[PDB]
Structure 1
Amino acid sequence: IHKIRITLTSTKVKQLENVSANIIRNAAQYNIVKKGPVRMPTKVLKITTRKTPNGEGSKTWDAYEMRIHKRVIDLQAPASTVKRITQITIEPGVDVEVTI
C-alpha cells in the first residue's frame, strides 16, 4: 500500500477531464481506494496591453487570458501500479506530476 498523489494541470479542460476520468477508471476496475478528482480553483492569468504598437489613437486595451485548471487525485496503491496507470493515461496537453 502507498498513499500517492497525482497532480494534473492544463489550460484546456476537455483533455484534462478525459485524463482525470481515465485515471479514476483505472483506479476503479483495480480495487484501489481513491479520493478525487479535486478540481482546484482555476487561475486566470490576465494581461491587459495597449492595442497600439505606437502611442496614437483612442486608448483601447486588450485583455488576454490564460485559464489554468488543476486536479489532484489521491490513490492508495503501489507506486508501480500508479505509474503504469499514468503511462496508460498519458496526454501531450496535460502534464502529470506524481508525489509520494
Structure 2
Amino acid sequence: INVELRLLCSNKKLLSDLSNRYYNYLFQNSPTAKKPRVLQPFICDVTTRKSPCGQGTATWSKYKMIIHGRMFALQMTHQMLKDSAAFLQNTDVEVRLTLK
C-alpha cells in the first residue's frame, strides 16, 4: 500500500520541475493526490583565505553547497509501483525508495 519516494538534488530548479511533473502524474491518476514535503536542506560549507600568499588585507570567503530534497508519501498497488518506477530514470536528481 504505502511508498515513500525521496527525490534528492543539489539544484533547485530541476527538483521543482521534476516534483511538479510527478505531482501532475499523481493528480492525473487521482489516488487522492497531494503535494511533496519540502525537507530541511543539507548544507556543507568551507571557509578559506582568498590570497595564495600572506600579502595584503586578509580577506575570507565562505563556499556552501546545498542539497535540496523532497519526499512524497503515497498509496499505490504493487503493479502501479513496478510500472511507475519507469519514470524514475535519466535524472540529475537521485531517487530512493522505502516500503512496508
Class of the TM-score when normalised by the shorter of the 2 chains? 0.7 to 0.9
Q: Give yes or no for the alignment of 1:47 onto 2:14.
A: no
> Runs of 4+ in structure 1 displaced over 4 angstroms?
none
Q: Is 1:23–1:89's contact at 8 Å kept on the other side of the alignment?
A: no
CA RMSD of aligned residues (A): 2.0
Q: Secondary structure at the match of 1:41?
A: coil
Q: What CA deviation, in whole Å up to 9, does each residue of 1:40-78 have, x standing for no partner?
A: 122332211111233332211111121221100011002
After superposition, what is the alpha-carbon deviation per residue over 1:7-52, rounded to whole angstroms, capped at 9, x for unaligned? 0111111110111111112112213234430001223322111112
Contact 1:38/1:72 (CA < 8 Å) preserved in 2?
yes
Shift of 1:83: 4.6
Provide the residue aligned with 1:67 in structure 2: 66
Question: What is the TM-score of this pair, normalised by structure 2?
Answer: 0.81
- Of all paired residues, the percent bearing the same amino acid is 27
- For 1:83 and 1:55, the matched residues in 2 are separated by 59
